[PDB]
Amino acid sequence: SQIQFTRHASDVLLNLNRLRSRDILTDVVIVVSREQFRAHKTVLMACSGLFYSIFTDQLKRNLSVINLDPEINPEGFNILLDFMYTSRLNLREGNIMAVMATAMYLQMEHVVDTCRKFIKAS
């Protein structure tokens, strides 16, 4: 039975976000209407059913650009991408509906569950 390091996973994630912030080894650009966001495909797959289903497929494995659905709110996507890399979700009454629709599209069931609880507690 192995020694558990309770802070390790959070430390790795912090460093993955630092790599994203310095554009180190990012391998995809997500185009959301007039905005673009660079990221690591590995993190996108790890956090989203949509990105998992795209990049596990050898047909799409090597794509360097992904164009999201035209109606996806870029603010909602930006908040979710930050969530992926930080474990912190920037939810408020002013963005709840946009964040919820985007998380349903991205297939992020725990975030959708949290959005539903935010509405229930409102």
Interface residues with ligand 8HN (CB under 6 A)? 45-49, 52, 107-109
Residue 66 or 111 having the CB closest to Cl ion: 111
Q: Is 108 in the site for Cl ion (CB under 5 A)?
A: yes
- 3-state secondary structure (DSSP) of residue 121: helix
Q: Which stretch binds Cl ion (CB under 5 A): 4-12, 20-28, 83-91, 111-119?
A: 111-119
Q: Is 68 in the site for Cl ion (CB under 5 A)?
A: no
Q: Count CB-CB contacts under 10 A for residue 85.
A: 19
Closest by CA position to 84, among listed 34, 26, 4: 26
Q: Is 111 in the site for Cl ion (CB under 5 A)?
A: yes
Residue 12 or 49 having the CB closest to ligand 8HN: 49
Residue 95: exposed, middle, or buried by beta-carbon count in 10 A (0-12, 13-18, 19+)? middle
Q: Count CB-CB contacts under 10 A for residue 77.
A: 22
Which of 38, 60, 110, 117 touches Cl ion by CB under 5 A?
110
Q: Which amino acid is at 48?
A: S
Binding residues for Cl ion, rule: CB under 5 A, are: 108, 110-111
